[PDB]
Symmetry: C3
């Protein structure tokens, strides 16, 4: 009977090992000793995708933490999967990830993984389909459940804002800013320790609206998705890419913390190659140097052998080209 | 086939015996002879809950009208139940209630029983989940079906507005006022005889925004849900409670009619007792004294043996502590 | 797969499968073809695709009968939201593809009509068969516009059949709100295919265009809809002058400035099959509305070429004409010559 459906519960914080909260201070993330912190890690696939082939298991997190140098895993929660498993079940699996990550001393970014224009509720593909109501309810449920959990560090409100050339609606920063502020307010009402992560347009590439109209809330960070072909100089060299990246997103790191929550590449004739992820490989060192110099955090897309661009070519973790490259970067940074 | 689905029908007003319309005049409800009317009664449970145990029957209304002194029953229509039964079936059951109530000379308050913040479509619990679209459609359908029906006196638009400490959204009176005004316009386009009942924030406790920004429509009343622990005076007496009640909701009764559409208590150590309904029993006399001196209408929550605070222990109507108290209040008021 | 991550991205209609057929465009108050010649849409509604499928009447032979024997150059498809949901987008679009091929084979054009009745801003409607949301409406037009990019056969996107608040029982009718919402739909459509013709309707069931004099839709290439059923205008004395004047006041004036399509019109006898206000008439309306539209150069699609939905143009699927059917058949055959 519907009147017997129970009220929800909160994650048991006493079940966790000691782990520092991460906080925002100025343009930096800091730990609870005030030391500058950067998120460095990978995306994995949606929980439901992983479960379907029995790959949702602690051993995945152990591989990443022990052999790939990560301190962070981004979970791209697809709305269609949230519905298919159902909130109750999906949250039970996120609980597993919290325990696994906490045991390894690594952090999670929870990403509401839609692509499109939330104010008109139009999207790139049905797997990303959602509504304002459902998006708010997702964040309400997450915020309540993971109150006071240091492991869950960042709430990435809406993966990739885009109107696809205004075919989805009229992109309007004021409208999107207001909606983000509304989501932030629901979260902060419930847990002030979490870091909301806000994205710009052009699939989370273009932060330039914040130069004059930044989100008017404290404690937030900005996302950036600097895939190789987002910037399109004729002469492909460091100086030209840096000029273009500076203008569209890199400038943000001067004032706010930035997480490049997707980045990566595959050869133009490789597996799952498509605009804007095609590159000859020179992008790898370029984006890493750029982020290193600016102190930008990152999670590579994607530690999965099916979804592209892949970091691994099979579930024995055989590295792809970009996987081998980023593996060494992250291991060296962990050292 | 969908193109053969019929258009809706209106309730047959000739099926009813004579019963006065209730109307709003200034700060009072009145009947069709101008006599001041006070709604005094109870909530019963959602229709679907009652049907599930075969307790949706005229006998329930007879018990209340004959033995408990009520002149009003409030029906808390839960959105999840509206969906589960479906509109067509649920309306057929409301039609039964209308006939039963009319035959007994009592009135109905129809309550769209949600708890949360309709402008952001976020709620306390999924049983209350709704949308602006579904809420409008509920009122559209009700207004059409029950046109010119005196028995159905009050349309209580949204039971308990709350943002749960702004976890559901940012409470904003202007926005809420505007949405109620939109709903009222839909209703009044269809039936100007009905009384809309509008609620404030803090679970329909706080009407204070209306001091400066009242709903800009005539013929409405305001809800109040003055549970015992809503007001929290350090020193618990008539003076301090009356002052706090005055400030947040009682003042409204100076200017508009007010229905306390939920009130009641359970002893603090009682099975199932919770904030804000815990009380040592002194609230009963105090809230009744306050309401009586201000001429405030009321429907006790709840005449059900399961849903708390209960007025009865079982379906033989054994009164609970608050049940026994309010029964004697209502029987005495009916004789006055 | 039954796996959601394997669901393909959508595809566009194969424009190479089509015979040559001119695009129709808007220029001033006229429709024109690709030679610059003034074009007039003249044809009929048929029923919703799902209704027709249910009895195996969604057939090429229906389009052939109309094009070959009834003088039409246009068919309007009234896509009901409940049917969109019942068949599902993917399947419904596959059936629209059939219509595109049929119409192109015959050299005739389609008007695609998102066939709801009510007030989209509040998402409240006349009947559940018309029920929709802003989200679903936008998505319909997004999908349609993508699929039929660069397809001349598909000429007009009729955004929302019949705006009405039913005496403000559905919401407060408000031109500014409605204008803005139509502009929003147009922007999404134009971002995907600038060649299409959006068709915008006013209140009172797509009858009152008068608000456009000072508050027209602020986009180029727009046509306006009117549904001038016989009892919409109510002159005290029934004669040509009084009907023409009332028609010009509420909608016909629009044709002086913009192209207009009367996407529903027609009548039945007051004691006839399915008779109801506002479609009852003794027949004098037929010559009147045709004379008026021909003077103004107004395009039209009669409601409806179906034996079940009323007012009918035919009594059976052998195409035996009803009173209005025979009348309009003669008019359209003469106009085609
Ligand atoms: O079935 C089609 C195709 O799917 C490919 O995997 C997809 C990923 O490439 C895709 O990654 C994108 C992110 O979701 C976006 O946020 C970002 O804009 O772009 C990323 C790179 O495209 O994710 C989806 C799931 O969201 C995957 O389905 C397969 O690799 C490929 O084999 C297959 O043909
Ligand atoms: O299943 C949990 C619990 O349900 C209890 O019954 C509930 C009622 O107590 C509850 O009453 C509330 C009103 O609906 C609200 O408007 C008001 O704010 O607060 C009232 C409580 O003080 O109603 C719900 C249905 O809406 C009932 O489920 C049972 O009493 C209890 O035994 C059971 O464990
Ligand atoms: O089942 C009831 C009744 O349905 C009739 O068919 C309906 C059509 O008459 C109706 O046409 C209307 C248009 O849809 C509207 O846009 C316009 O305002 O009014 C038209 C009528 O004047 O369409 C619906 C589908 O939308 C049909 O169901 C049958 O003709 C009748 O026999 C039957 O009893
Ligand atoms: Cl519970
Ligand atoms: Cl576990
Ligand atoms: Cl964009
Ligand atoms: Cl803040
Ligand atoms: Cl009876
Ligand atoms: Cl509140
Ligand atoms: Cl406020
Ligand atoms: Cl008024
Ligand atoms: Cl109207
Ligand atoms: Cl207006
Ligand atoms: Cl334009
Ligand atoms: Cl009629
Ligand atoms: Mg946390
Ligand atoms: Mg484009
Ligand atoms: Mg009434
Ligand atoms: Mg008894
Ligand atoms: Mg076209
Ligand atoms: Na579009």
């Amino acid at each position: 009977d519907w009147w017997d459906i129970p009220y929800p519960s909160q994650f048991d914080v006493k079940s966790l090992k000691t782990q520092s909260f991460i906080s925002v201070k100025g343009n930096k993330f800091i730990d609870d000793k005030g030391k500058t912190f950067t998120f460095r890690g990978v995306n994995i696939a949606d929980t439901g995708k992983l479960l379907s082939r029995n790959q949702w298991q602690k051993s995945l997190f152990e591989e990443l933490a022990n052999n790939w140098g990560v301190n962070t895993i981004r979970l791209p929660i697809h709305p269609v999967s949230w519905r298919k498993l159902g909130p109750d079940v999906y949250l039970g699996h996120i609980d597993e990830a919290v325990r696994w990550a906490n045991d390894l001393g690594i952090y999670l970014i929870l990403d509401w993984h839609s692509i499109g224009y939330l104010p008109t509720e139009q999207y790139q593909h049905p797997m990303y389909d959602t509504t304002i109501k459902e998006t708010r309810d997702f964040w309400r449920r997450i915020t309540f459940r993971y109150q006071n959990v240091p492991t869950v560090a960042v709430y990435e409100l809406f993966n990739e804002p885009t109107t696809m050339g205004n075919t989805l609606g009229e992109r309007n920063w004021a409208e999107w800013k207001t909606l983000n502020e509304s989501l932030i307010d629901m979260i902060y009402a419930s847990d002030k320790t979490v870091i909301p992560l806000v994205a710009g347009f052009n699939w989370a590439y273009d932060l330039s609206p914040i130069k004059k109209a930044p989100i008017e809330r404290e404690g937030i960070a900005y996302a950036a998705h600097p895939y190789p072909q987002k910037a399109k100089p004729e002469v492909k060299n460091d100086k030209n890419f840096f000029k273009l990246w500076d203008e569209k997103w890199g400038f943000a790191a001067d004032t706010y913390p930035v997480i490049a929550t997707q980045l990566g590449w595959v050869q133009p004739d490789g597996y799952g190659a498509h605009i804007p992820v095609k590159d000859d490989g020179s992008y790898g060192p370029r984006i890493v140097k750029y982020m290193q110099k600016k102190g930008v955090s990152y999670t590579v897309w994607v530690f999965d052998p099916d979804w592209s661009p892949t970091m691994i070519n099979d579930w024995d973790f055989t590295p792809s080209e970009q996987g081998a490259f980023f593996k060494q970067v992250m291991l060296e940074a962990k050292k």
